[PDB]
Amino acid sequence: IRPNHTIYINNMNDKIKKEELKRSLYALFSQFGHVVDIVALKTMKMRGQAFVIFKELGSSTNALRQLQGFPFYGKPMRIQYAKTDSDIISKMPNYILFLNNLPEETNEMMLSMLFNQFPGFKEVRLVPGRHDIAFVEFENDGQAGAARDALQGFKITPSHAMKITYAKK
Amino acid sequence: VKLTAELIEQAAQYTNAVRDRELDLRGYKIPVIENLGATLDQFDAIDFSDNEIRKLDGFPLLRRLKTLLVNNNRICRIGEGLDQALPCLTELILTNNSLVELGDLDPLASLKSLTYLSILRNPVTNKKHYRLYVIYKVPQVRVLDFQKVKLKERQEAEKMFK
Amino acid sequence: PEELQKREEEEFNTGPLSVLTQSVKNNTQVLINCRNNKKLLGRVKAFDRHCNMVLENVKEMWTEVPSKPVNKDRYISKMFLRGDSVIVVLRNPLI
Amino acid sequence: METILEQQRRYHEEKERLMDVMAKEMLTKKSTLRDQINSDHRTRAMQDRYMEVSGNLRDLYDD
Amino acid sequence: MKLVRFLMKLSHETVTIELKNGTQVHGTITGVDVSMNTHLKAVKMTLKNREPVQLETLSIRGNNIRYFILPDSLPLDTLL
Amino acid sequence: SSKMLQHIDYRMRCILQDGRIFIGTFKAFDKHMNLILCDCDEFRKIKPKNSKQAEREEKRVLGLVLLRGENLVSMTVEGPPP
Amino acid sequence: SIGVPIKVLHEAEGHIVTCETNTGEVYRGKLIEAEDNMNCQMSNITVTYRDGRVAQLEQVYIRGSKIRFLILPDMLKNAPMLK
Amino acid sequence: LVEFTDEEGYGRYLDLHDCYLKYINLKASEKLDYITYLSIFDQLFDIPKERKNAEYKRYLEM
Amino acid sequence: AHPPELKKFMDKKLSLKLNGGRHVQGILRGFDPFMNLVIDECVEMATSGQQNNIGMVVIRGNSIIMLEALERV
Amino acid sequence: QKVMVQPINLIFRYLQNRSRIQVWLYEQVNMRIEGCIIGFDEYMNLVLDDAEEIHSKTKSRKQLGRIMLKGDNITLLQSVS
RNA sequence: GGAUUUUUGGAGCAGGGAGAUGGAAUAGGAGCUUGCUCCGUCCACUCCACGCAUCGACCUGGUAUUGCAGUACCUCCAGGAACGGUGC
């Protein structure tokens, strides 16, 4: 299952009122991240279920890591990633790091996505030669330090974990 | 970094998911709360996730507020004179703090209009006869830790510490 | 234009607003009932088609229940008054 | 804290500054009524400060 | 002649407008238009049987005003 | 001058004829003084009906509001553009 | 011409709006057609009747002079007339 | 301008127009101009305007 | 001075809601730009349950709050 | 394709038949003024012959004669005969 | 450009009756303080006519639904009625 912003919730108590449920869900999920929207429907198809839409993907992962089987209004709730993305989300040391154990398939955009998180990247070179190797260059050294600290042991495609080291002269 | 009106004026001001007026203060590492009256009483819910607030105090008179969200802070002591400044509160969200003793929850009985409380991830939850002491202490709360109060809890709350 | 200005003066001389015209002629007070039951005793400086008024020396009297209701009055010196709130304009008031 | 020496010295100095400032005002020319009354009201607040500082100076000699 | 034109030549004049819903708005006029809508600043606004609140500015619609209280220091013959 | 255009996009409080209060982001207006208020909340004063009951204010969330101009009495500002 | 608010109201037609009449009755339904003088016709109306009595009417036509206000759908908050 | 009104002109004049309006209400008759009102306030130790035991006292206080 | 779009509601059974809480039902027979309606088979229904058939009436437009289509239109 | 009974036609039919017309009142549910319509004009101001107020509370009818009921008061024009 | 859907307003005013019922710390008058008596302003309870009937929100107990969606509102039974408005 892929990580989404919206967490789907079933196995809730359906006897509570919808507005009390919405206040209680905003209370229960204000801890993990910023809740932009909650969808609580009381119709016979969708009663007892809720959807909580978050701004960031990490807070949904934190909510799924914390609230496995949370006693909520007398019922242990079951939270999953929701199968579909939302409406609102769908609408909205050295500079050079040497990377090893990189997936061959990895797309350029993907690499920018993972590495770019710690800011602006000067350029990345993938190895057409020794495969699964790459050089990631950051414009700022501070950014590079942060990436290096965080990235090592990074899990991209769980089969492999990346090893990142500072480039050596 | 200390909190001033400057971080109030720049922060996100909007309508929340439960359709109240919201000011967001996520990720500011605020240790002390002061100078909130520049919100001009246009708000019903103020978030305070990820701040280093040691004590929930310094709260000025804001009448329209119905929710305080104090998720993941370092509340070891609590303020006592809160009900005089937040008269129409309905939710207090005190999750993931360091409340340890039963008497530390004692100022919360002063809010008459209080209906929803959340004191989860706190050491004060760890001790025995906790929830009945909250009910026997603050009777006006209808939802405690997302568990609705029951009359057996009211009876065994009245029975103890007589 | 100018023919409308002669038309409005002859119409205000002969029509229903003549008394307001008379109130700006010899400068006597009129008693004006308002929609919130306030009587206004005062001269009129100027008026228009809508009976909007600019008024001097106004005594606004009205009746307030606290029992028996009392005739609490106030003295507004100069004022403007929108014309849709005017009920009744009587040219000569008795006292 | 040197109440005897430092605090009384500072309060005496602050009084001297207030006297110099409202003297500088009474030395300068005035041109219109608004700004005359404004300075005279300003000098009143300075006198209120002078009286309060002189209060505190007199209630700091028992110890 | 229309008297709304008399009212539009009032700016920075401190009036007290009595509205149609028993309201008393004491403030200085920043603007009146041809439809008698009055924009005031430095407003002391008292609703019916309520305490006087104060507002930085107000913008009253024209039909909702009932009468004015103009200042006594107003030469109206030059204003007409 | 077009004075209401200066008050545009502000958080504005609008007083209706029956006594309601509309706090909304004042987006647009016209000749009849209709209003478009984004994120608007209405406020009804509630009569106490007792000697000892207080007077409360009930707030409804509305959203995007078209307010017809014949209802409007007076508008004041509450806040800067959010 | 036509004002910006009545243009927004015309944009709101086809969507579920909520009228409040002068008598306080709340008519929430799909705005079939709106008019320049704010005459609104709505289908799938759920009326509140000012004492709580929520009934369901179909195909009402509300006179615009009696409309207190019109809660439009919030998805029109990004309309280019509002800009 | 938080201490003086415009008619007072910062110590130049005193506004007695408001007091004149309260005075019309107090006498219950309009036979009295602003100039006639000022002649009343030129009085010092002579005959009073109204009987000194009447309602004139509340006005005199204000 | 645009006429209302009541061409759907013509010759259809309506349920008017007039001011003062008054309620009349009937077949809409015509309208003007003022939304003054002409109602055929007009039955007035008061606060009491009994309903007075008043036949053919002219309703001034400024008293109408609402009109419900009792037929499908 | 449909032809319309505009209300001036029907008020003029009330004029032509000289029928006694009951007139409801705007924001006055108690009183209904009925009379024979002699004539009417543009703003629906009516004149009535032998008009009478009917207060529904007191159930009493006060005779007036020839009145000119101003048009903005009218809610409904009902024919009693 | 004051004659039915917007801007010259159809708005204003008052909360049923009774009882040797109870209170105005600092704020009623008169019998020219204090004590007492009388009369045109509230809240709490009781009685007649819990002012009446309606629906929505809401609290206790039991009970049913385990369902992937962009929402006036959502299971049912019984008790209580703190709130809102509608007509008398």
Sort strands E14-19 and J74-79 into parallel, antiparallel or unpaired.
unpaired
Q: Are strands J46-55 and J28-40 parallel, antiparallel or unpaired?
A: antiparallel
Q: How was this structure determined?
A: cryo-EM
The DSSP bridge pattern shows strands I13-18 and G67-72 to be unpaired
Of C57, C74, C76, the CB nearest to H30: C57
CATH of the domain at C79: 2.30.30.100
Nearest residue of chain J to residue I64 (CA atoms):
J75
Q: Are A121 and A140 contacting, i.e. CB atoms less than 8 angstroms apart? A: no
The answer to whether E24 touches E16, Cβ cutoff 8 Å, is: yes
Q: How many CA atoms lie within 13 A of G43 on its CB side?
A: 9
User: Which strand (E) or helix (H) includes residue F28?
Assistant: strand F21-29
Give D31's DSSP letter: -
Residue F34 CA to residue F40 CA, distance in Å, equals: 14
Q: Which residues of H touch E72 (CB under 8 A)?
A: 7, 17
- Which domains are assigned to chain I? 7-69 (2.30.30.100)
Residues C33, C38, C44, C49, Cα dihedral to 10°: -50
C-alpha to C-alpha distance for F52 and F49, rounded to whole angstroms: 9
Using the Cβ of C78 and the Cβ atoms of chain H, whether some distance falls under 8 Å is answered with: no
Is the Cβ of F3 closer than 8 Å to some Cβ of chain E?
A: yes
Q: Report CA(G55)–C1'(K2) in Å, whole number.
A: 39
A73–B146 CB contact, under 8 Å: yes
Taking CA atoms, C3 is separated from C6, C11, C49, in Å, by 5, 12, 16
Dihedral sign, Cα of residue I28, residue I34, residue I36, residue I38? negative
Flag if E70 and C36 touch (Cβ within 8 Å): no
The CATH number of J6-80, from 2.30.30.100, 3.40.50.300, 3.30.420.40, 2.40.10.340, is 2.30.30.100
Scanning every strand, the nucleotide with its C1' closest to J43's CA turns out to be K3
DSSP bridge partners of E38: E32, E60
Task: Kindly determine whether residue B148 and residue A35, on different chains, have CB atoms separated by under 8 Å.
Answer: no
Go through J10-32 and write b for each residue having 16 or more CB atoms within 10 A of its CB, e for each that does not. Answer: bbeebbeeeebbbbbbbeebebb
Please report which helix (H) or strand (E) contains residue F39, including its range: strand F35-45
Say if CB E64 and CB F74 are below 8 A apart. yes
Q: What is the DSSP string of chain B?
A: ----SHHHHHS-EEE-TTSSEEE---S----S----GGGTT--SEEE--S---SEE------SS--EEE--S---SEE-STTTTT-TT--EEE--S----SSGGGGGGGG-TT--EEE--S-GGGSSTTHHHHHHHH-TT-SEETTEE--HHHHHHHHHTT-
* Under 8 Å between Cβ of F58 and F46: yes
Q: Where in E1-77 does DSSP place strands (E)? A: 14-19, 24-32, 38-46, 52-60, 65-67
Are the C-beta atoms of residues A154 and A162 closer than 8 Å to each other?
yes
Q: Which residues contact B38 (CB under 8 A, 6 or more apart)?
A: B5, B8, B9
Q: Find the nucleotide nearest A11 (Cα to C1′).
A: K66
Whole-Å CA distances, C61 to C65, C87, E48:
14, 15, 18
CA angle, residues I43, I45, I50, in degrees to nearest 5: 100
Residue C81 contacts residue C53 (beta carbons within 8 Å): yes
Residue whose structure tokens are 């007339």 = G81
Give the tokens for residue C69.
């209701």
Q: Which residues of B touch F78 (CB under 8 A)?
A: 40, 42
**Which residues have C-beta within 8 Å of that of residue A102, sequence separation ≥ 6?**
A111, A126, A132, A133, A134, A160, A162
**Does G21 contact chain I (CB < 8 Å)?**
yes
The candidate with the shortest Cα–Cα distance to G66, out of I60, F59, C86, is I60
Q: Which domain holds residue C92?
A: 3-95
Residue of C nearest to H32 (CA): C57
Contact C36 E22 (CB under 8 A): yes
For residue A45, the number of C-alpha atoms closer than 13 Å in the C-beta half-sphere is 0
Beta strands in chain J (DSSP E): 20-25, 28-40, 46-55, 60-69, 74-79
Domains contained in chain E, CATH given = 1-80 (2.30.30.100)
| Chain C residues whose beta carbon lies within 8 Å of the beta carbon of residue H25 | 73-75
Give the residue from C61, C75, C78, C95 with the most H CB atoms within 10 Å of its CB, the best one to mutate: C75
Please, which residues have CB within 8 angstroms of residue J27's CB and are 6 or more apart in sequence? I19, I20
Phi then psi for residue I23, to 5 deg, are -140, 120
In D, minimum Cα distance to H8 occurs at D34
Q: G21-31: b or e for each residue (b if 16 or more CB lie within 10 Å)? A: bbeebbbbbeb
CATH number reported for the structural domain that contains residue B85 in this entry: 3.80.10.10
DSSP string across I33-71: TT--EEEEEEEEE-SSS-EEEEEEEEE-GGGEEEEEESS
Amino acid at I69: A
- Please tell me the distance from the alpha carbon of residue D14 to that of residue D9, in angstroms, as a whole number: 9
The C1' atom of K57 and the CA atom of F32 lie apart, in whole Å, by 35
Listed in sequence order, the residues at least 6 apart from B52 whose beta carbon sits closer than 8 Å to its beta carbon are B29, B30, B31, B73, B74
HSE at residue I54, side-chain half, CA atoms within 13 A, is 27
C-alpha–C-alpha distance, residues A72 and A9, integer Å: 11
Question: Measured between CA atoms, how close is D33 to chain H, in angstroms?
Answer: 7
With an 8 Å Cβ cutoff, are D34 and H12 in contact?
Answer: no
Residue D7 DSSP one-character state: I
A27 vs B96, B118, B148: nearest CB = B118
D50 CB-side CA count, 13 A: 14
Strands (E) across C2-91 are located at 30-34, 39-47, 53-64, 70-81, 86-90
Q: Are strands A96-100 and B45-47 parallel, antiparallel or unpaired?
A: unpaired
Å: A42 CA to K55 C1': 20
Contact E21, F17 (CB under 8 A): yes
CB pairs under 8 A between B and F: 18
Of E43, E45, E59, the CB nearest to F7: E59
Residue nearest to nucleotide K10 (CA to C1'): J27
Angstrom distances, CA of residue H21 to CA of C45, C73, E2: 19, 11, 29
Q: In the sheet where A96-100 sits, what is the strand order?
A: A121-126, A133-138, A96-100, A161-166, A154-155
G38 touches chain I (CB under 8 A): no
Q: Which nucleotides of K are covered by protein (CB under 7 A)?
A: 1-14, 40-44, 53-76, 83-88
Query: What is the DSSP code (8-state) at residue G80?
Result: T
- List of residues 6+ apart from J67 with CB closer than 8 A: J33, J35, J47, J48, J51
Compare all CA atoms of chain F with the CA of G74 and give the residue at the minimum distance.
F64
Q: Which amino acid is at J31?
A: M
The residue with tokens 């505190």 is D56
Q: Are A133 and A99 in contact (CB under 8 A)?
A: yes
Cβ-in-10-Å burial (0-12, 13-18, 19+) of C42 comes to buried
Nearest nucleotide to the CA of E64, by C1', is K9
d(CA J40, CA J11): 8
**Count of the separate structural domains present in chain G:** 1
Instruction: Say if strands G16-21 and G67-72 run parallel, antiparallel, or are unpaired.
Output: antiparallel
Burial (CB count within 10 angstroms: exposed 0-12, middle 13-18, buried 19+), residue F5: exposed
CATH number at residue G64: 2.30.30.100
Separation between Cα atoms, residue G15 and residue G32, nearest integer Å: 8
Alpha carbons E57 and E30: distance in angstroms, whole number: 9
H17 → closest Cβ in C73, C74, C77: C77
The amino acid sitting at G47 is V
E55 in reach of chain C (CB within 8 A): no
Query: Among all strands, which nt has the closest C1' to C37 (CA)?
Result: K12
Q: For residues F39 and F79, give the distance between their C-alpha atoms in angstroms, rounded to a whole number.
A: 13
No. of helices (H) and no. of strands (E), chain D = 2, 0
Q: Note whether F44 and F20 are within 8 A (CB).
A: yes
| Residues G3, G5, G10: CA angle, nearest 5 degrees | 95
Closest residue (Cα, C1') to K43: F51
Asked whether at least 3 C-beta pairs link J and G within 8 Å, the reply is no
Residue with tokens 């209302």: I4
> Which residues in chain F have Cβ-Cβ distances shorter than 8 Å to B44?
59
What are the residues of chain I with a beta carbon less than 8 Å away from any beta carbon of chain G? Answer: 2, 4-6, 8-9, 17, 19, 21, 35, 61-62, 64-69, 72-73
What's the DSSP call for residue F56?
-
Length of chain D equals: 63
The secondary element (H helix, E strand) that includes residue J13 is helix J7-16
Residues 6+ apart with CB under 8 A from E66: C34, C35, C36, C81, C82, C85, E18, E19, E20
Rounded CA-CA distance A48/A76 in Å is: 12
Judge: E19–F73 Cβ closer than 8 Å, yes or no: yes
Amino acid at A127: V
CA pair distance J34, J52, nearest whole angstrom: 5
The single-letter DSSP state of residue A130 is S
Q: Is the Cβ of C59 closer than 8 Å to some Cβ of chain H?
A: yes
Phi (first) and psi of residue B154, to 5 degrees: -65, -40
The Cα-based distances of E26 to B105, E15, E39, G68 in angstroms read 48, 6, 12, 27
d(CA B82, CA B76): 16
**Taking CB atoms and an 8 Å cutoff, what residues of chain C touch E66?**
34-36, 81-82, 85
Whole-number distance in Å between B43 CA and K14 C1': 38
Query: C80, C81, C84, C87: which to substitute to probe chain E, counting the most E Cβ within 10 Å?
Result: C80
Q: How many domains does chain C have?
A: 1
Contact in structure between J58 and J76 (CB atoms under 8 Å): no
DSSP bridge pairs for E41? E28, E57
How many angstroms separate the CA atoms of I40 and I50, rounded?
Answer: 19
Q: Are I5 and G33 in contact (CB under 8 A)?
A: yes
Q: In degrees rounded to 5, what are phi and psi of residue A133?
A: -135, 150
Q: How far apart are CA C24 and CA C47, in angstroms?
A: 9
* CA atoms of E32 and A100, how far apart (whole Å): 74
Q: What residue is closest to K7 (Cα–C1')? A: E63
Residue type, J46: L
Domain boundaries, chain J: 6-80
Spell out which residues of chain H touch residue C74, defining contact as CB-CB under 8 Å.
Answer: 21, 25
What span, in angstroms and rounded, lies between the C-alpha atoms of A33 and A57?
9
Contact B69, B48 (CB under 8 A): yes
- Give percent helix, percent strand, percent coil of chain A, each to the nearest 5: 25, 30, 45
Distance, CA of E8 to CA of E15 (rounded, Å): 13
Report the distance separating Cα F72 and Cα B141, nearest Å. 39
Tokens linked to H3: 């201490």
Query: What 3-state DSSP class applies to A77?
Result: strand
Domains of chain B: total: 1
